[PDB]
RNA sequence: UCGAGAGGA
């Protein structure tokens, strides 16, 4: 129920997809991922009233390529970033620590 | 006086209201519903549509100062509201 | 690695201020908020009031025992009320602990938060611990009582996100910046005369370099470099603050993920 | 000038609540009427034995604040050891368009 | 791939930043021809024009052709993108100037040119604006 | 309360008020320029 | 008074109201709480009893639920009480207090209520916190402010009510409000602000926002925009984001005296089915104003999507601020050293100049201005001085002022801009007045202790040199107040008057309404009006247009007029018609063109009779100028070619549409000469801007086109026709309570008729 | 002041005018002084003028005042508004008031007359007079409880 | 009434130092803001919520109760 | 009602009468839409919360209060809003207790003068950055501390509403008072705008089905309302007329019927009837 | 049950 998935109307290879329970957290995050995808022609989102962790995304792709396969190769990019950026910020910690065991 | 009336054949706003009104309440009713049902569930939108598509067996008792009185079907009246 | 590059300028118990680049704005953005709202972390929700003797009011109180800092370093260990299947509490989602007073010299007696004492059992999970800053280990001042000012009561808390409430901010502030030299001109500095003497220049400046007049505005720049400075209320260490707010918001992309799966 | 007198200090000729007006020489007028007559309606504390006190209809600031700019009049009015407010962070822009 | 109906080179008469601080209102006057003045509103932060330079001013009459507004990335293949200050929009209005010239209007997304040319007889709705130099 | 007791009523702005009432400290409505305070 | 003209009642709610940026005209925040109070008694149905049994399973514990069955006898079942709810099945016939639902029509008011745009209905959108929600721009109209404004609220039960509140006081359906021919609301305060920067010029975005707002549009085509830049990088206009909300098809074209086809400050406002390209969105074009975007809007499409059009633009407006962000500050008030020291100047340049007036009056020098004491005339003087020096301070403080200047931009817009404002903030605050004088003296021969008797130096009655910012010297600060209390007295009294003026006219008027034979009488039958207004015609199909045959030369009008195919002074161009030399020659149709030459000729001295103030601008029905382009528009014509067009066509067709324009329906001459009377005016100008020179020459359109305008022309006459049955009166008062609220003593020196005149007074030329 | 005046030429031009302003009003002498435009001369007092010159002419007179007062702030409503309420008041072959001794002192249904700002006094005339309402008022229809004949009760279905 | 816990802006924890801060105001005979910086509270959103608090609570607890 | 027991009083009268006070309490937490004033006159409501990250943060870090529109500051003339707020933020840094009283010679220079000294612009903006991208905001805030206060009406207190509540006895009408389940006063006003709009039905609704509905019966040979009814029999007379015929069903409003009532104690005959004696 | 008074919009 957290994902609500429909294909748009006013464009082929489009789909809208409603997230519940969510805010601009992640909706910033995944919606400039997909625009550093070659094969998307459009994504955008938005939010219906403040009072909801309601999250409408509208996103258009080339032929032949699963919109939803489109997200999906996004998270898997994210989630590596993000491994990256945590083994990065892992040593760069181990070593500021090694500095900072004199001096917290 | 039918003939030579000396009236509008256009519908007035107030009249096309009293006329959805009218209908909406028979069919709240249970009124013979003189159209098929498109899910249009609610009867307000059931009495614009039969108005839409002119099938209200209505006539309205138009009045005059003088207390004369002109008898227009809504099949006579002209619908533009 | 290739990821984002990550450089520690200063770190400290207190805080830590880094560099980040190799990433786009949307990440550092999402970082930064994950880090103020999504992380769990142990907070006092239920109060029983034994006797109040005191001045102040129960919920005044109580309002301010919510704001007392915690031991939070095994968090996941500990559970949710909602998830967990004791009633009302238990240790394996909550801890308990209790302050009993009592006035005794004509003198202010100062409650602080030391005088709390845990009484669930931790299973040794590092866990429950009040935190304290002071130089005397005082603690948090939680009230004052007179000459004979009587206060018990018992306090159970539990684990639950600052985004649920504040209470649960482990969080304290975050210094967050880029293009000090405004080189990707996101920003038309308001001035009476000039900008660059009415404006002051941020510390961040002297890492990069100025810019140059002649220079055409290189529309193809992003915001690459970031400068974070991210402190902590106390209640874990600044490093695993980023560490767990980095792994909470892949939980969530991979949640978001196998919701995906699902349909 | 014969002057035969000086007004001790002109703030002086200023009233009760328009005491707690800040810069009141630098607003319009009625703009200053009026924050004097919200400041018949702005809560803080009444009295310190408002626990004695059995009364209805208290409204007790969970953490009252002494203005940051404060007037000369107000260390008789007592206002800072009793005031009423807070000072909280303002910011003077459109964010959200609620 | 175009079938462009105007082309020559302006050299700049004027710059005029008309308070503005990315756009300037320009004015040039065709190489060669006289007859031919161009007005335009450019976005000089992004084209760093200056006073008497000579442009290549060109309208796409066709779509240069690569090879709903189709996404960014048409580098991909090759097309009339030599140029440096590329516009598009609408033709605004075309006034005749004496029966002799035609001071057509121009606006992309507000921002306006204007030419005049009877012997430049292009004519349609909407074309882009090719500016190398 | 410490206007109030200070407050002043008119039975149903001249210069003389100067240095006397707060030329501000007015009510609304009809006491309005009515009502004064010292 | 307490019990039949006014009485409390049920089904009603009132609370503050709160806003949302996010919401839409005709749809309103409800506060879950209320709806749990609040349902409606629905008559079971077989196309309803589904989700209705559903709702009685839910009960009244539940946001979506009913709280009382009620059976065709009469019992209503309680479900609080009663586990029934999950037991009862429900029979048509049956009523069931519904839980009220989104999308339930539902009626509010603002109190005081002024007049009728106090009074419209919603559409229910439930909310969980504790306040009502209203779209930003209703309030005007509402006279509303979120100070903490509460308002009444009023639930239908019998469903005739509802589509009766539906097609009488939905929002949209009084947009524009008839009391002055104009929008009776428009876009405010924020949005009105950030558009001006949105619009401007200057203005650029970047792919990543396109792709947003394009979305946060509801109503978007779902068609992506070209960049406007393409080369050195996409991007678009805020120009083109505006458009895109913009429905198409519309024509607006306003001109000003920047106007030049090119417009450097794009001044005026310009656009083509929707595509902007001249003039910076202001205050005129997006405000209440009858000459902007709304109101044009109304006309081509209609209510129903005017609605959807300030959404599409309130949304929007928002959003790009959102990530622009707009503020203000002290900086925008200070001015330089130079702009003070020139002001410094100006008020001493006055001071002096008072001086010198002054030892002039000391003198007995100076002279009595005709018929008035030469002391008041010193003052006329003296006051009309410092008038300029305040207000050229604020002259030379607004030039001197930065575009960066974010009140400066606040006022350009116009959102509750004031020039007098920045002046008194930045420059002198200017003289005080009471009763429109000078400080008086209370104390002898002086108005306070500071000053010696008998002294009138600018600052000694009542000015003010110093700027707000610079703060008031208690000199001044007491004079300032003095002013205040004026001001705030006048608040009140005007609160409690004004509603016994208001009141009293409201009962004037009440029994007036009109007729269906399009006449006016009283409850009595006695005839106010023959014809409704004297021209039959609902003031809200009205707007001011020229009359071009009044203006201009005597030369002048023959010639835009006047055509010959004759002689060569007013030689037709064969061109401009498929036919040529077939016309030129034709005594005939020059014939033709005589009688409409001539009768136009008429038609000008009779206008010039009708106004001798010789204003060329009056409200009509219609605006033929409007409709013109649309035909242009309508088939895109060609201008460049010749057209099928005949005189004969020409003339015939508005001869046609004048016979068309039957407002009457009495054949009796009687009638019938009323019926020409009340176009009398409207055919005129129909026959100027429809005169064949101006057909031809200036609007070369088709045959086809042409009679399709004709055919446009006669709908929208006749749907111009004012209603029958209209409370006019009740309108009518209201119209003139509304301005009341903001001379006005004479109104009731006027209501009241007071033989006693206060100010008697005669015109002699 | 200065005038619309057509021109010759055709095209209406300022033209100066010398126009005399005075306290006080009296028609009567002022309309014989030779030298000036009788017909042109208004005046502030409608009362007198429609005294001076009629009903009807009045009529338009307290228009003019009427308009010149709406105006005087700057604010605008539609012509026919203002026609409307002025024309009532001179239905009644003089310049009605819209005050107790006006308006209400007028022959319609009672009922209505009396909510306006007398009702107990009026009631003892009705019965005094044996008077007799057509139920056609508003009012007495919302007394009565009834669907007022008015808009969209003006008829019947 | 009794100093706040956290900084309203930061949440930066505060109800330990009132001690310490009245002991460099008297003991060390600082102006305020020496002890502050003293203090840790850089960011004025933090030094706010010390230089106003008003103890209300000592003078409630002169009533014998 | 919603509290807490907070304290007892039992005691009595100087003649021994017992009395008891009872002190209950409860916490009024700032709910959407309830007033705050400035010290300048400037009011309003609240809008709407967010959690910090939402909101604009500064460089710093710092998480703005309270939000107002520019667009309320230059047309009300309140330069000392922000005065305030410029030596108030000068105060906090320079941690100095400001000094606002009139007539000194404080002015914005040596104020802004000495903020540019600790580092901050010199007329009080900040680089903002958007709460949900994070990207630089193109103006520049105002921005800095006030001393704002909270007013007594509450929101939660304001709101009421109701329907087939209890009825006020002597007209039958709603019953009023917020605590007593009051109605809301329709006043003459209202049904003057809705006869502008024409909807006398929903007219007719209100006045009637809201409230003062009733059934009555009338005698055809007097328009008086002296009718027997026995619906236990459904036998019907008028006594005097001595019609069983000439009775007919009216709704007519509850108050109004005593006022006819009234009326016929005032010896007036204001006969109805359902028949127009008029013929044309 | 009335009366008064405060305050809001
Ligand atoms: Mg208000
Ligand atoms: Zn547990
Ligand atoms: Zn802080
Ligand atoms: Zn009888």
């Given at each position: 129920?957290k994902?609500k998935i ?19 957290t ?8 997909l ?6 022609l ?5 939010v219906?009233?403040?009072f ?7 996103i258009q792709?080339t ?5 939803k ?24 910690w ?6 900072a065991?004199?001096?917290? | 006086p ?9 519908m ?37 549509k039969?108005?839409?598509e002119?099938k209200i067996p209505?006539v309205?008792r138009?009045?005059?100062?003088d207390?004369?009185?002109?008898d ?6 002209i619908?533009?509201? | 690695?290739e ?9 400290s118990?207190?805080?830590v ?9 949307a ?11 999504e ?5 006092i929700?239920?109060?029983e009031?034994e ?6 009011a129960?919920?005044?109180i109580?309002?301010r025992?919510?704001?007392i ?6 968090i996941?260990?500990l559970e949710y009320?909602?998830?967990c299947?004791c ?12 302050l009993?007073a ?7 007696t ?16 590092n ?11 005082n ?13 018990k009561?018992?306090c ?10 504040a ?6 502030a ?19 005369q000039?900008?660059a003497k ?8 002297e ?15 992003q ?32 949640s978001?993920?196998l919701?995906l799966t699902?349909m | 000038?014969?002057?035969?007198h000086?007004?001790?200090?002109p ?13 009141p020489?630098?607003?319009?007028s009625?703009?200053?009427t009026?924050?004097?007559?919200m ?11 408002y ?5 209805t209809?208290?409204n ?13 009049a107000?260390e008789?009015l ?13 910011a ?5 368009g609620? | ?25 320009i ?12 007005t335009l ?15 290549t001013?060109?309208?796409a009459?066709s779509?240069n052709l ?12 090759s ?10 929009g609408?033709?605004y ?16 997304g507000?921002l ?12 349609q709705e ?8 | ?9 008119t039975?149903?702005?001249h210069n003389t008020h100067?240095?006397?009432?707060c030329?501000a400290?007015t ?10 305070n010292? | 008074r307490?019990?039949?003209?006014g ?17 839409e005209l005709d ?5 879950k ?5 609040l349902?409606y008694?629905?008559?079971v149905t ?11 399973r839910?009960?009244?514990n ?9 059976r ?20 048509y016939?049956w ?29 229910v959108?439930?909310?969980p ?7 930003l721009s209703?309030?005007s ?9 509460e ?6 039960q019998?469903e005739?009510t ?19 021919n ?7 305060q924020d ?10 010029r200057?203005?650029?975005?970047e792919?990543?926002?396109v ?11 779902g ?7 393409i ?9 083109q984001?505006?458009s895109?909300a ?23 406002m ?5 595509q ?5 969105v202001?205050?005129?074009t ?6 902007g ?15 959807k059009l300030?959404?599409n633009?309130q ?12 503020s203000?500050?002290?900086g ?16 001493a ?7 010198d ?10 002279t009595?201005k005709?018929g ?10 003296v ?7 305040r ?11 930065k575009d960066?200047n ?11 801009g004031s ?8 420059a002198?605050v ?5 009763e ?8 002898v021969?002086?108005?306070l202790p ?10 000694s009655?009542?000015?003010v040199?110093?700027?707000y ?26 609160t409690?008057?004004?509603g016994?003026?208001?009141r ?7 029994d007036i ?9 009283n ?20 707007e001011k ?10 030369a002048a009008?023959?010639k ?15 061109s401009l ?21 001539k ?15 010789g204003?060329?601008?009056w409200?009509?029905?219609?605006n ?17 070619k010749?057209?099928?067009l005949?005189?004969?066509?020409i ?5 046609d ?14 009638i ?13 100008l ?9 057909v ?5 359109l ?6 399709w305008v ?14 029958p ?6 309108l009518?008062?209201?119209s003139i ?9 004479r109104?009731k020196?006027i ?8 100010t ?6 | 002041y200065?005038?619309?005046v057509?021109?010759?030429t055709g ?7 010398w126009?005399?302003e ?11 002084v ?7 001369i ?8 429609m005294?001076?010159?009629?009903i009807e002419?009045?009529r ?11 105006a005087?702030?700057g ?6 508004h ?5 024309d009532?008041?001179?239905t ?13 002192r ?8 009396c ?11 009705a019965?005094?007079?044996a008077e007799?309402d057509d139920?056609?008022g ?8 009834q ?11 | 009434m009794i100093?706040?816990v ?25 102006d305020?803001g ?6 840790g509270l850089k ?13 209300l609570?000592?003078k409630?607890?002169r009533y014998?109760? | ?5 907070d304290?007892?009083l ?21 709910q959407?839409?309830d007033?705050?004033?400035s ?15 939402d ?8 998480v703005?209060?309270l939000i107002?529109?520019?667009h309320?500051?230059?047309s009300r003339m ?7 707020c410029?030596?108030?933020?000068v ?8 000094d606002?009283?009139?007539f000194?010679?404080?002015?914005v ?5 000495l ?12 680089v903002?950055y958007?709460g949900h ?6 103006a520049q ?7 704002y206060?909270?007013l ?5 207190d ?7 509540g209890?009825?006020?006895v ?6 009023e008072?917020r605590?007593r389940?009051?109605?809301l006063?329709?006043?003459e006003?209202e049904?003057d ?9 929903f007219?007719?609704?209100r006045?009637?089905?809201?409230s ?5 019966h009338?005698c055809?040979?007097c328009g008086?309302?002296?009718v027997?009814?026995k619906?236990?029999?459904?036998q019907?007379?008028?006594k005097?007329?001595?019609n ?7 709704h ?5 019927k ?5 009326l016929?104690?005032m010896?007036?005959?204001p006969?109805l ?8």
């Open positions: 129920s994902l429909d294909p748009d109307t006013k464009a082929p290879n489009a789909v809208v997809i409603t997230f519940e329970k969510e805010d601009h992640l909706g910033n995050l995944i919606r400039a991922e625009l550093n995808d070659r094969k998307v459009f994504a955008a989102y938005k219906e009233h403040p909801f962790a309601r999250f409408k995304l509208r792709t032929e032949g390529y699963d919109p396969d489109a997200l999906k190769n996004a998270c898997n990019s994210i989630i590596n970033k993000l491994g990256a950026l945590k083994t990065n910020f892992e040593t760069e181990n070593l500021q620590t090694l500095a065991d004199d001096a917290f | 039918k003939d030579q009336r000396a009236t509008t054949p256009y007035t706003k107030y009249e096309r209201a009293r006329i959805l009104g009218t209908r909406a309440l028979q069919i709240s009713m249970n009124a013979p519903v003189f159209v098929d049902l498109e899910g249009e569930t609610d009867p307000l939108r059931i009495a614009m039969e108005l839409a002119k209505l309205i138009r009045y005059l100062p207390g004369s009185f002109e227009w079907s809504v099949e006579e009246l619908v533009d509201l | 690695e990821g984002p590059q990550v450089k520690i300028r200063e770190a118990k207190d805080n201020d880094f560099i980040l680049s190799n990433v786009d704005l990440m550092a953005n999402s970082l930064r908020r994950v880090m103020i709202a992380i769990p972390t142990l907070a929700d239920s109060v009031v006797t109040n003797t005191t001045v102040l129960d919920e005044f109580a309002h025992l919510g704001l800092p915690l031991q939070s370093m095994d996941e260990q009320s909602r998830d299947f009633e009302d509490h238990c240790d394996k989602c909550s801890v308990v602990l209790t009993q009592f006035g005794e010299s004509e003198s202010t100062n409650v602080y938060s030391k005088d709390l004492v845990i009484v669930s059992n931790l299973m040794g999970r866990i429950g611990h009040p935190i304290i800053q002071d130089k005397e280990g603690g948090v001042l939680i009230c004052k009582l007179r000459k004979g000012q009587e206060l009561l018992t159970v808390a539990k684990k639950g996100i600052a985004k649920e409430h209470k649960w901010g482990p969080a304290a975050i210094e967050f910046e880029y293009d000090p030299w405004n080189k990707l001109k996101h920003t038309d500095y308001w001035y009476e000039d900008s009415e404006w002051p220049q941020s510390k961040n400046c890492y990069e370099d100025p810019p140059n007049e002649g220079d055409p505005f290189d529309y193809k720049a915001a690459d470099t970031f400068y974070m400075n991210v402190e902590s209320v106390g209640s874990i260490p600044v490093d695993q603050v980023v560490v767990r707010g980095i792994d909470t918001l892949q939980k969530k992309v991979a978001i993920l919701a699902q | 000038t014969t002057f035969t000086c007004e001790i200090h703030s002086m000729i200023l009233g009760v609540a328009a005491s707690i007006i800040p810069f020489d630098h607003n319009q009625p703009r200053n009026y924050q004097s007559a400041g018949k309606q702005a809560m803080g504390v009444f009295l310190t034995n626990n004695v006190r059995m009364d209809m208290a007790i600031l969970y953490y009252p604040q002494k203005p940051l700019g404060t007037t000369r107000m008789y007592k206002f800072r050891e009793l005031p009423a407010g807070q000072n909280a962070i303002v003077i822009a459109c964010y959200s609620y | 791939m175009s079938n462009t109906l105007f082309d020559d080179i302006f050299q700049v008469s004027e710059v005029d930043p008309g308070r503005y601080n990315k756009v300037c209102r004015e040039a006057a065709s190489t060669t021809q006289d007859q031919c003045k161009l509103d450019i976005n000089v932060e992004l084209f760093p024009v200056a006073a008497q330079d000579s442009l001013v060109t309208i009459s779509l690569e090879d709903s507004w189709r996404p960014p990335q048409a580098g991909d293949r097309l009339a993108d030599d140029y440096d200050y590329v516009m598009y609408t033709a209005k075309f006034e005749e100037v004496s029966k002799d010239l035609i001071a057509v209007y121009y606006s992309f507000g306006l040119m204007r030419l005049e040319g009877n012997l430049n007889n292009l004519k909407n074309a882009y604006l090719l500016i190398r130099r | 309360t410490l206007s109030h007791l200070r407050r002043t009523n039975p149903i702005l100067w240095g006397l009432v030329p400290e009510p609304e409505g009809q006491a309005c320029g009515l009502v004064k010292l | 307490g019990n039949l003209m009485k409390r009642v049920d089904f009603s709610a009132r609370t503050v109201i709160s806003g949302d940026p996010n919401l749809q309103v925040g409800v506060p709480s209320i709806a749990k109070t349902t008694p629905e008559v077989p196309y309803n009893i589904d989700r209705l049994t559903q709702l009685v839910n009960g009244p539940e946001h979506p639920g009913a709280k009382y069955v009620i065709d006898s009469g019992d209503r079942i309680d479900l609080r009480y009663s586990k029934r709810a999950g037991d009862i099945q429900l029979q016939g009523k069931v207090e519904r839980h009220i639902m989104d999308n339930d029509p539902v009626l509010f008011n603002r109190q005081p209520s002024l007049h009728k745009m106090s009074m419209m209905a919603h559409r959108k439930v909310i916190y504790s306040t009502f929600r209203l779209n209703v309030t109209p509402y006279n509303a402010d979120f100070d903490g404004d308002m009444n609220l009023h639930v239908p019998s005739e509802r589509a009766e509140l539906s097609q009488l006081c939905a929002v949209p359906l009084q947009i524009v409000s008839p009391q002055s104009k929008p009776c609301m428009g876009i405010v949005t009105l602000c950030g558009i001006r920067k949105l619009t401007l200057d203005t650029f975005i792919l990543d926002q792709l947003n707002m394009l979305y946060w549009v509801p109503d978007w085509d068609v992506i925009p070209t960049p406007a830049i080369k050195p990088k996409p991007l678009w206009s805020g120009k984001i505006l895109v913009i429905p198409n098809g519309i024509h607006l074209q306003r001109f000003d005296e920047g106007t030049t086809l090119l417009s450097p400050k794009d001044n005026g310009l656009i083509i089915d929707g902007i390209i001249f003039g910076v202001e205050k005129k997006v405000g209440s104003s009858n000459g975007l709304i109101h044009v809007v109304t006309r081509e499409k209609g209510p129903q999507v005017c609605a300030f959404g633009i949304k929007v407006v928002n959003f790009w601020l959102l990530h622009n962000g707009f203000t500050g002290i925008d008030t200070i001015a330089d050293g130079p702009t003070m020291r020139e002001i410094t100047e100006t008020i340049e006055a001071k002096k100049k008072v001086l007036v002054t030892k002039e009056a000391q003198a007995n020098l100076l009595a005709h008035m004491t030469l002391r008041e005339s010193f003052e006329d003087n006051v009309r001085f410092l008038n300029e020096a207000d050229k301070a604020g002259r030379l403080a607004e030039v001197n002022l960066l974010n009140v400066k931009q606040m006022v350009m817009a116009g959102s509750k020039f007098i404002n920045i002046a008194q903030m930045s002198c200017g003289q005080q007045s009471v429109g004088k000078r400080i008086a003296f209370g104390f021969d002086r108005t500071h000053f010696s008797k008998d002294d009138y130096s600018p600052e009655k009542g000015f040199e110093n700027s910012l610079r703060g008031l010297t208690p000199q001044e600060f007491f004079f300032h107040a003095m002013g205040g209390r004026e001001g705030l007295i006048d608040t009140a009294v005007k409690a008057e004004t016994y003026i208001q009293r006219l409201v009962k004037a008027l009440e309404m009109v007729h269906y034979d399009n006449t006016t009488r409850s009595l039958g006695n005839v106010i009006q023959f014809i409704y207004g004297e021209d039959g015609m609902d003031a809200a199909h009205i247009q020229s009359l071009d045959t009044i203006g201009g030369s005597d009008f023959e835009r007029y006047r055509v010959d195919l004759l002689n060569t002074d007013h030689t037709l161009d064969p018609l498929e036919s040529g030399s077939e016309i030129l020659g034709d005594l005939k149709l020059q014939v033709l063109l005589d009688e409409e030459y009768q136009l000729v008429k038609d000008r001295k009779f206008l010039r009779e009708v106004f001798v103030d204003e060329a601008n409200p009509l029905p219609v033929i100028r409007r409709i013109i382009q649309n035909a242009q528009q309508t088939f895109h014509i060609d201008h460049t010749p057209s099928d005949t005189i004969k066509d003339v015939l067709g508005v001869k549409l004048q016979e068309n324009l039957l407002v009457l329906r009495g054949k009796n001459e009687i019938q000469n009323a019926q020409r009377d009340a176009v009398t005016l409207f055919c005129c129909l026959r100027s801007r429809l005169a064949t020179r101006r031809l020459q200036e609007y070369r088709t045959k086809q086109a042409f009679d004709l055919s446009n022309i006669e709908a929208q006459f006749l749907r111009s026709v004012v209603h049955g209209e409370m006019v009166g009740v009518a008062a209201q309570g509304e301005p009341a609220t903001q001379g006005v003593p109104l020196e209501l009241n008729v007071a033989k006693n005149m206060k008697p007074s005669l015109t002699v030329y | 200065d005038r619309k057509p021109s010759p095209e209406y031009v300022k033209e100066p005018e126009v005399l005075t306290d006080g009003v009296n028609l009567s002498e002022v309309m014989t030779p030298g000036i435009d009788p017909t042109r208004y005046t502030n007092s409608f009362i007198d003028i005294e001076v010159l009629g002419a009045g338009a007179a307290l228009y003019k005042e009427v308009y010149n007062v709406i005087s702030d604010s605008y409503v539609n012509y026919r203002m026609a409307l309420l002025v009532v008041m001179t009644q072959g003089g310049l009605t008031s819209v005050t107790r001794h006006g308006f209400n007028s022959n319609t249904g009672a009922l209505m007359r909510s306006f700002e007398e009702t107990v006094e009026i009631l003892f005339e019965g005094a007079s007799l139920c056609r508003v009012s007495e229809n919302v007394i009565l409880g669907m007022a004949p008015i808009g969209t009760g003006a008829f019947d279905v | 100093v706040p956290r900084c309203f802006s930061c949440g930066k924890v505060v109800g330990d130092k009132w001690e310490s801060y009245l002991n460099l105001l008297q003991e060390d005979e600082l305020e020496t002890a502050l910086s003293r203090l960011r004025y959103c933090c030094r706010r919520m010390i230089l106003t608090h008003v103890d609570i000592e409630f607890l014998n109760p | 009602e919603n509290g807490i027991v304290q007892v039992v005691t009595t009268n100087q003649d021994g009468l017992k009395f008891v006070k009872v002190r209950v309490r409860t916490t009024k937490i700032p959407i839409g007033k705050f004033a010290r300048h006159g400037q009011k309003g409501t609240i809008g709407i919360t967010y959690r910090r990250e909101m604009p943060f500064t460089a710093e870090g710092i703005p209060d107002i529109n520019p309320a500051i230059p309140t330069v000392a809003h922000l005065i305030e410029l030596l108030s933020k105060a906090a840094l320079s941690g100095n207790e400001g606002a009283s009139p000194t010679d404080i002015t220079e040596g104020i802004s003068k903020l540019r000294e600790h580092g901050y612009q010199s007329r009080g903006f900040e903002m958007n991208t994070g990207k630089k905001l193109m805030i105002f921005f800095g501390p006030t001393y206060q909270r007594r009406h509450m929101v939660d304001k709101i009421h509403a109701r329907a087939r209890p009825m006020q002597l007209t039958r009408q709603p019953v008072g605590s389940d009051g109605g006063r329709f006043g006003m049904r705008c809705m006869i502008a709009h024409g909807a006398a039905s007219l007719k609704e006045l009637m089905e809201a003062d509905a009733f059934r009555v009338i055809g040979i008086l309302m002296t027997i009814a619906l236990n029999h459904n019907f007379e008028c005097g007329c001595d069983k015929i000439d009775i007919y069903q009216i007519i409003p509850y108050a109004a005593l006022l006819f009532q009234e016929m104690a010896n007036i005959t006969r009837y359902t028949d127009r004696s008029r013929d044309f």
